[PDB]
């Protein structure tokens, strides 16, 4: 019971301390050639955790925390591991003092909700949509990259895309669902456009007319095959109705539209694009309103999707893209048409636009903002220590044990920035106890000061979600007391 709980504690603490130095922007890169040749040179600990050979349960639950924190807010991936590992390390004192893990876990729950309610009103919240502070958070996020010169190229485009559809999803917050994204290799970085409706990037090359104002859309996933019976009837149905733009899928076989049916579908010259992407197929259907139907006898008259302008148009001079407006309910995931001749200006632009998405959905699910970089952790370690002084019973140390485990985030931020960690942490505590909350460690210049002047700030829900997930998994691993193999 205790001998396996201690092994869970030690394994999760060891897998948390393997990425503990990578906290902060000065977090150094790693190299683990474990497995069969992994040259793992990266300063970000999320991809380090995704390549860690993990056999222990409690070591794998923090890898689950990493992906959970990346799903909820997209930032603070190493923080939810370091907080959890320091908490589980601090559980050993409570275990050896005599407290049962149930009391430890419920006192951590009490300390968690106390820390959430302490963080939620010590913020500097935004009052409106406040597009100026969205661009301010973009300067905190979309810059310090190679898209720093593409920051004004990319931030107000997404800001205006949320301005277009302030979409009712999780209390009118930013979903992954504003206006459908595409990306095209080649072009310049300035060749991004904000669209209204469906765009296709793939190569449709029709000499005839694909430019119909009432562009009727179907999704026939029935391609052509090789034994005339189950071959031409869908094209006869096309001649019946007149769906002039239809996205082709090769779900049946490989010869998708052979010249028998291809000239039949080039006697009116339908849009032809094959091998459509499976996760975006259902979003395309949510856009259009047609039915994703492969059975050619299930093609009905109510499968006729709507489109207004459908062209194989050379957008930006040469990009033969198929843009579509005028649908049933278009708008599937926030549009940044990533064009770039270089490859790094493709991938970093799209990755930073996803970063911008995961911070603006953080900025409006919870509409507050704090000064990041070790300041709220010191604030929690002060106020929870006072609360644990007020608290009675065996929980009175555990919340205190919750407090000191909060202190690893500034200290690592003190250590990775080269400062002497313990003295700078307690000097930060002395400054905060008589001064302000926003005092912390400016890692961007390497010095302890008021961060709200030096502008290293973060939305509140990153810290709240990281504390929630870390306390949840610490609670679970404390409650875990038995394992068994051999089913």
């Amino acid at each position: 019971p205790a001998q396996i709980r201690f092994s869970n504690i030690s394994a999760a603490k060891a897998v948390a301390d393997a990425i503990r130095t990578s906290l902060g922007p000065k977090g150094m890169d790693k190299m683990i050639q474990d497995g069969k040749g992994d040259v793992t040179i990266t300063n970000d600990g999320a991809t380090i955790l995704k390549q860690m050979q993990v056999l222990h349960p409690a070591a794998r639950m923090l890898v689950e925390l990493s992906k959970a924190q990346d799903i909820e807010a997209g930032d603070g991936t190493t923080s939810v591991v370091i907080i959890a590992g320091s908490l589980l390390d601090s559980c050993t004192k409570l275990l050896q003092k005599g407290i049962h893990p149930t009391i430890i876990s419920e006192s951590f729950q009490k300390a968690l909700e106390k820390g959430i309610e302490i963080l939620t009103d010590m913020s500097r919240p935004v009052e409106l949509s406040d597009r100026e502070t969205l661009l301010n958070s973009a300067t905190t996020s979309l810059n310090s990259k190679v898209v720093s010169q593409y920051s004004s190229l990319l931030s107000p485009m997404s800001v205006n895309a949320v301005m277009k559809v302030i979409d009712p999803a999780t209390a009118t917050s930013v979903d992954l669902r504003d206006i459908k994204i595409v990306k095209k290799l080649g072009g310049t970085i300035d060749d991004c456009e904000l669209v209204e409706g469906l765009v296709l990037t793939q190569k449709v090359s029709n000499s005839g007319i694909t430019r119909v104002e009432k562009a009727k859309i179907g999704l026939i996933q029935f391609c052509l095959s090789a034994p005339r019976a189950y071959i031409l009837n869908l094209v006869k149905q096309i001649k019946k109705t007149g769906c002039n733009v239809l996205l082709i899928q090769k779900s049946i076989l490989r010869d998708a539209l052979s010249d028998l049916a291809l000239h039949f579908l080039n006697k009116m010259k339908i849009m032809v694009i094959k091998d459509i992407e499976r996760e975006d197929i259902e979003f395309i259907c949510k856009t259009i309103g047609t039915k994703p139907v492969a059975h050619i006898d299930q093609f009905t008259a109510d499968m006729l999707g709507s489109a207004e302008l459908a062209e194989e148009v050379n957008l930006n001079g040469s990009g033969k893209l198929l843009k579509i407006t005028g649908c049933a309910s278009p708008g599937k995931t926030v549009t940044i048409v990533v064009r770039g001749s270089n490859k790094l200006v493709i991938e970093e632009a799209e990755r930073s636009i996803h970063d911008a998405l995961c911070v603006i959905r953080c900025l409006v699910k919870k509409r507050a903002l704090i000064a990041g970089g070790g300041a709220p952790e010191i604030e929690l370690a002060l106020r929870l220590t006072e609360y644990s002084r007020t608290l009675s019973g065996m929980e009175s140390y555990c919340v205190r044990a919750f407090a000191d485990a909060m202190e690893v985030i500034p200290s690592t931020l003190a250590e990775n920035a080269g400062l002497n960690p313990i003295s700078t942490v307690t000097e930060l505590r002395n400054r905060h106890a008589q001064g302000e909350k926003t005092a912390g460690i400016n890692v961007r210049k390497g010095g302890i000061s008021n961060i709200l002047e030096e502008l290293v700030v973060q939305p509140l829900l990153v810290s709240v979600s990281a504390l929630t997930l870390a306390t949840e998994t610490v609670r679970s691993i404390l409650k875990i007391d038995d394992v068994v193999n051999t089913r």
């Binding site: 150094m28 890169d29 683990i32």
Partner: protein
């Protein structure tokens, strides 16, 4: 302060003695030296950054 023109006294690349270079014509483009110092510092910073492994 007056002997600012004892500055380019480099090494003889053939026989190894303290010797003039501006009068001797020993020359190298400044962009070469600047870019070599830049890339050497970048290499040193990158290999010093790979530090946090017991390996």
């Amino acid at each position: 302060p007056e002997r600012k023109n004892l500055k380019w006294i480099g090494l003889d690349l053939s026989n190894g003695k303290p010797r003039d270079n501006k009068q001797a014509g020993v020359f190298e483009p400044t962009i070469v030296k600047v870019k070599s110092l830049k890339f050497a510092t970048e290499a040193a910073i990158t290999i010093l950054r790979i530090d946090d492994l017991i390996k």
